[PDB]
Amino acid sequence: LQNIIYNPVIPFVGTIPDQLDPGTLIVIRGHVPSDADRFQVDLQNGSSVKPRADVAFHFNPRFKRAGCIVCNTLINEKWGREEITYDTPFKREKSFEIVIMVLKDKFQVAVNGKHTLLYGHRIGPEKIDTLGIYGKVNIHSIGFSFS
Numbered sequence: 253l254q255n256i257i258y259n260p261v262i263p264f265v266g267t268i269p270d271q272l273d274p275g276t277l278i279v280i281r282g283h284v285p286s287d288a289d290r291f292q293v294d295l296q297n298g299s300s301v302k303p304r305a306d307v308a309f310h311f312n313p314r315f316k317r318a319g320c321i322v323c324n325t326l327i328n329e330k331w332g333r334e335e336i337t338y339d340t341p342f343k344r345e346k347s348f349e350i351v352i353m354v355l356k357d358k359f360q361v362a363v364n365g366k367h368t369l370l371y372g373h374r375i376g377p378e379k380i381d382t383l384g385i386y387g388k389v390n391i392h393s394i395g396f397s398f399s
């Protein structure tokens with residue numbers, strides 16, 4: 253793991269230090285606080301707030317009832333079609349490890365050592381330069397492994 257960031261302040265917005273070529277890993281460790289409604293990891297084209305930066309990959313756990321993960325893409329401030337994963341491995345009051353692997357045609361996401369979902373590229377991964385983490389979550393560390 254390279255360019256490791258420890259105990260960032262949330263919301264975190266930071267520049268990904270190298271290109272997201274296939275085989276690249278983003279490793280995020282943290283825990284979900286007890287009153288958590290949702291949080292999100294956003295892979296962004298830039299960090300502009302107005303107009304809001306495009307989000308190539310929105311990864312968004314929600315914690316109401318059984319919960320879900322919602323994945324989507326924001327282009328010119330418009331959300332596309334949602335892809336919802338109902339079998340969530342996140343729970344309130346539990347620690348997690350998210351590993352996002354970038355492949356040629358999609359992201360693959362594993363949580364706590366177990367494959368969770370695939371998400372097909374809607375924007376070219378070469379446009380992504382910014383990692384954003386927002387909402388009710390505590391991040392212990394963020395690390396990269398570049399191919």
Ligand SMILES: CO[C@@H]1O[C@H](CO)[C@H](O)[C@H](O[C@H](C)C(=O)O)[C@H]1O
Pocket residue numbers: 310312322323324331334
């Ligand atoms: C129809 O709810 C929207 O769903 C979106 C996901 O497609 C996204 O999760 C939005 O969350 C917040 C408001 C955001 O990051 O803009 C939410 O309001």
